[PDB]
Design a protein around this ligand. Sequence first.
Ligand SMILES: [Mg+2]
Ligand SMILES: [Mg+2]
Ligand SMILES: [Mg+2]
Ligand SMILES: [Mg+2]
Ligand SMILES: [Mn+2]
Ligand SMILES: [Mn+2]
Ligand SMILES: [Mn+2]
Ligand SMILES: [Mn+2]
Ligand SMILES: [Mn+2]
Ligand SMILES: [Mn+2]
Ligand SMILES: [Mn+2]
Ligand SMILES: [Mn+2]
Ligand code: NA
Ligand code: NA
Ligand code: NA
Ligand code: NA
Ligand code: NA
Ligand code: NA
Ligand code: NA
Ligand code: NA
Lengths: 387, 387, 387, 387
Amino acid sequence: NYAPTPVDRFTFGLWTVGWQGRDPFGDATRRALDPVESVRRLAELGAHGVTFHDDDLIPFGSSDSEREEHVKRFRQALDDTGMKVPMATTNLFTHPVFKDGGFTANDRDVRRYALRKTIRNIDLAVELGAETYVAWGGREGAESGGAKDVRDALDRMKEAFDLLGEYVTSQGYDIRFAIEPKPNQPRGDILLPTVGHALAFIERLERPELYGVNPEVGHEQMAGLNFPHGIAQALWAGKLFHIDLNGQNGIKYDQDLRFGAGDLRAAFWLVDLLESAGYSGPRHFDFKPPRTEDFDGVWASAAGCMRNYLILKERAAAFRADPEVQEALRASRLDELARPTAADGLQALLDDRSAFEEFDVDAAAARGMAFERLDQLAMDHLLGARG
Amino acid sequence: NYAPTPVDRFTFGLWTVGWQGRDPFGDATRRALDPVESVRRLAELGAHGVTFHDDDLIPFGSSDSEREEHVKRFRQALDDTGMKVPMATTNLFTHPVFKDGGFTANDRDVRRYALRKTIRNIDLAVELGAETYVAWGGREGAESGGAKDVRDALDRMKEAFDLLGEYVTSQGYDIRFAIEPKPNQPRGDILLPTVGHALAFIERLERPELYGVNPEVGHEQMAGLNFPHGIAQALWAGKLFHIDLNGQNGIKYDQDLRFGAGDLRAAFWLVDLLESAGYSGPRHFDFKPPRTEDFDGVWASAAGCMRNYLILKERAAAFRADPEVQEALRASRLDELARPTAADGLQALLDDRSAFEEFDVDAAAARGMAFERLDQLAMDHLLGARG
Amino acid sequence: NYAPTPVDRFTFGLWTVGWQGRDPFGDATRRALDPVESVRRLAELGAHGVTFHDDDLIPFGSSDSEREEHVKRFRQALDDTGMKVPMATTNLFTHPVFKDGGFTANDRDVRRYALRKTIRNIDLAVELGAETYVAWGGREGAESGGAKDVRDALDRMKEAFDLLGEYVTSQGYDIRFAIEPKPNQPRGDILLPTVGHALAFIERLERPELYGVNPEVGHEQMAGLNFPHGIAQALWAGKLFHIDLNGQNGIKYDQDLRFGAGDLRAAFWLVDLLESAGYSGPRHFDFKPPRTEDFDGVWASAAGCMRNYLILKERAAAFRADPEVQEALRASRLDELARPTAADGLQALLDDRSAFEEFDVDAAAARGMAFERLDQLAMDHLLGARG
Amino acid sequence: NYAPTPVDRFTFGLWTVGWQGRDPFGDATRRALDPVESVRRLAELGAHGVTFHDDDLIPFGSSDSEREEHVKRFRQALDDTGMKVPMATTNLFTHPVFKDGGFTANDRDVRRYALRKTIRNIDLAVELGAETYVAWGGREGAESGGAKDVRDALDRMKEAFDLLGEYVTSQGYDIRFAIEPKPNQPRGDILLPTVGHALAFIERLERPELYGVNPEVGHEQMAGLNFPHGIAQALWAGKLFHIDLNGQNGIKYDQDLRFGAGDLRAAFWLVDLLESAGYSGPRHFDFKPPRTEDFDGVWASAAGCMRNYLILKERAAAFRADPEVQEALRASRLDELARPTAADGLQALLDDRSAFEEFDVDAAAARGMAFERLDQLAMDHLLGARG
Ligand SMILES: [Mg+2]
Ligand SMILES: [Mg+2]
Ligand SMILES: [Mg+2]
Ligand SMILES: [Mg+2]
Ligand SMILES: [Mn+2]
Ligand SMILES: [Mn+2]
Ligand SMILES: [Mn+2]
Ligand SMILES: [Mn+2]
Ligand SMILES: [Mn+2]
Ligand SMILES: [Mn+2]
Ligand SMILES: [Mn+2]
Ligand SMILES: [Mn+2]
Ligand code: NA
Ligand code: NA
Ligand code: NA
Ligand code: NA
Ligand code: NA
Ligand code: NA
Ligand code: NA
Ligand code: NA
């Protein structure tokens, strides 16, 4: 039961199942995986595709001949399995040169290098068929207040993204960018810390249509925010170009638990929203099998990501299709929420005594919302305990 | 020392010093204050002005004659003291009718009433000379996932703000709106939970120039965010129309401590930013003297808000003016951060071997940022411990 | 399905279903309930009993004749329904006199009054058959560092609890005390902020056997802690005298959501632990139907507390009884965790080359824990998705 | 000004200034330091001593001859500088063998090895003159609920600490143990997550007098707790055997900022408490110079730890010595808090009409606490802004 299919579009970063287990306090617990191995094993589990940072696929500093051979082997694995590459990204965070940032490093020479490193990988992403190019600016930020003038850093961040937009336009590429917010870690505070901040920033770019967000479940939860609500705002803005699925237990370091772990009810409401809205992008997992696990546990954890999505999809669909739930939604006036407040227009509203002088505030206030019964129907559906 | 002056533009809500001390677990500890008393006492402390919700100035449900008398007495107090009213707002949160929201209540009749209540108070705000009209949507949100379709709620929130913009335009008013984010409390999650989300929303309004943000120190800190960074993004966007100053100890219920309490170093960096950027708006305190205090403690707490701002202003100015700090800022390349990455343009960057093939990444990575010495100069300046 | 029974021992505070909906920003949305009404309605839902603060049952300041009549009516309702009263507590937080504390108020006269108020209610609790007397010191703490010397406050807190222990011993009562930790709210920081701090404090009382903890799900989660882990430590110490069940979404104000809401997987692991350990005390709900609800929603929310406990009990029992789970627990070495490390004794351990010189650390490190497969079996059992 | 002296007893872990800068997302930015270098540089800054994990001083897996040479070189550096070694600890977290724990690993063979590794290093600590042996169980815990039975793990943790106590007793050593709590990171939840939980656990050991706590500023703040309050409880219990000083910005990953950074006012109240209580132990810094820094920044950051302690010591002493503050403390009844509630005894309290029938609750409730004026005097003293 709960078998992944190609139409599910489940994807995984090479760096997810390939995470060797090094953490702030501990050495690696697993050997490095050849990307070819990961492609073949993920395909066997029913995944649709993989994603990569440049330096996951091509060791940093590789010669041109080494780069060609790494890509050739990877493409053979994709061809052997039918796996796709819908998204790629740049590693602008691991190498010491990026310790104060890539696009917003105080040193101008580093900013220029970061752009050139990204541009090289955009070309490769396009060659591999990627539709989306993610940017997670994990080193953009500060540990102290004097170190980073945020207005100047935002100017540099806009300049960088504008140059990348000019680049893809000039090459006729169809790829689009997706900015991944995170509030902190590894910097004390990261620039563009939430979906909202990233959405706002995009509106000030020269070609805003080329940019959207890549929100990650656990990152919004590191600020204690409601991830489904943030996804709703991104969908409302037309900017949900990609998504990173995982689990997180609240306000901690970025745990990258398998999807469904962490906040299970938020996972339910997320799946309900994505499916109801008809989100058509990859269901991408940015997760880490815990370092306690051997490779059998790696593949079990990856399989669990997909399984949990599919269970939640079933339960959310059953919730929405249940005539008792539909009745409860009407009892709670969800239908009214979807109607305009004043399609009659401002003057009619100003002239409407039923909206002021003749509005019975105490009668209105007496009406219960019936939200608790609705939420218990949702719980019963999630748990398969209807009756 | 540290005496407030009119040019400081310190303002206070009537509901701040007037808070009677009722909390989720406790009854009021102080009697209600007449707004006239608060105006006169705040003026004696050196405040510039006050702000109000409709229902702070005019008891809810007042007749027209009662409304006139309350406003007349208030205006006499303002005239007697020289106090100004730069901002006003609507209470769309206390009355039970607003239990599921004002502008985004599921019930359409409530949404219409909320708009009419706001419009009536915009007229009064203009009559009192207010330049800014704040909206804190404290009841907009949910405790459960099925209760609120966030895309529909954002449609209703946009409709409401668009109608208000049409209203002020039609009346020829110069007032502008400032949306106040908060992540949670009193709703389990509040819509537009951070500065970023509010900035993004504004960009989708029909007349975006009429709307900005009113960020509150403690509200961003309830999501664990860096308040100075968020203010920098608002300034970068041209949207810092007003600000609420207070203190908060991290991720808790909204404490509304006096300004300078809570995160003292964030208060320092905030003042540094506001002064450096030339922010010209009110320095408004949205705070609550703790319920442990009698009225002498109320006025001490209000005086402390202003005193702490002025101490921090002095220390931040001394930091920025110190030639040793200026040298440290250059050592940390803050000057380079402010220079364009690639004013030479995209093609020149692509052709520049110094940005890629000839970039010595290991030499760059070896350069220290010297951020710790800079931050210790900042600490020494804050504490008055230079030497 | 999932029908409560008397052996379930589900109990509710009068103040839970009786919460009128006043919050930091909003007036009451529901009328006050007569305790008699609550007893009868809860009995109809299958509850076992209720609990009370003194001032929930007897209005503060009541005369002796008024007190007798309130108790008489309540006892008739208990007799009419078969409902029990297993626990009672004192309100040492609502009245303004307690603004700086009860037992740890700086004012000595207030500390003495708090003790006398508690002692009067202990007598009533015993008359009603209560086995446990809870103390939640919600006003014990501070908003500022100079206001409360914590060593002195702990001396006063110990003195108070020691006097109460002397009192019950002198009267021959069998009741025992349960201290309820909370980290903050309504004070900026509350003394004894977690289960651990309360357990440690108890060990320093004169008669430690008379005192245990009353942990509350949401309170430990307000510090981001693992509630099942804290309950395990309380059980390990022999100190889980009572428990408060509810839901919470992380690090926020105390939400008091119905049990099962908030962190659903933590609710699952809690029920698993309580049932596995054979906890025999009340399953008490300290929750608040949201103020959006009318009385039908109040009773739906209360019913949901019990329903969710019973669903989780079923799923946890099925998890533990599943031979595949039992095999997975052995694969993960949970059996070894339960065996002594060195029952052979210290000298044998020191002499055992297999523990040092001949321990193959790399072979040990290569063994996977298989925790992810175990956790996915747990997820499948919780969701009723085995297959 | 603010020059460290030997009587200040400032100490640093080898792993602090020696941190190479590897984080969850980034490679090392600094070369490894020879411990001899660190001893000499710290001595030049005015430090009193260093501390070490076994594997900081002796590379893991060293032969006996290699171990002797590493210790000999280290001791020469200590002799050359006058530096002391007051504390040592075991690394039971870096090596992959410890991925599920040391003392509470599910695998019994790992638990036995962890004990033998610790015992070997206790012998070395004693040879170097250490008075305290710290244990930070960073791998004790879980990412999932089924992986770790916490009651069984606490049994194993008690068994381990009891064996270590038997060991030191049998060898006649004067060293004592200090358990270092942390709530999470690197495990999803860590056992003994706070000062309170560790204090409670110690009370159940066979020889409780041999064990205390080593609280760390940032670790308690990762649960949003008040670090000065927790230190007060440890002092009240007689269990503050050692302390780790650093800075933290709230509920995040463990930042290990220099002391004084992070929550500056909590640092002030901590120093006030340690000095007022006469804490006589090391002022030990467990911090990490940010990876942005070169070695000059490492030493600047270490110097800043000591400087900030000394500034705060001066300001706290001036606060306590100021006759205006002493008057404010009396106005706030801090003197009464330190007096017994009922030295007259229980029967006298029960017979005292002034404690109940004749207690004027409304007159008591009207008295203000004057805490805001007291706290503003504290702020003025911290900032050197008295006047
Ligand atoms: Mg619709
Ligand atoms: Mg500039
Ligand atoms: Mg057992
Ligand atoms: Mg004393
Ligand atoms: Mn992540
Ligand atoms: Mn991601
Ligand atoms: Mn606030
Ligand atoms: Mn505000
Ligand atoms: Mn609670
Ligand atoms: Mn409770
Ligand atoms: Mn730490
Ligand atoms: Mn430490
Ligand atoms: Na700039
Ligand atoms: Na979209
Ligand atoms: Na709509
Ligand atoms: Na602006
Ligand atoms: Na005392
Ligand atoms: Na127990
Ligand atoms: Na055991
Ligand atoms: Na001590």
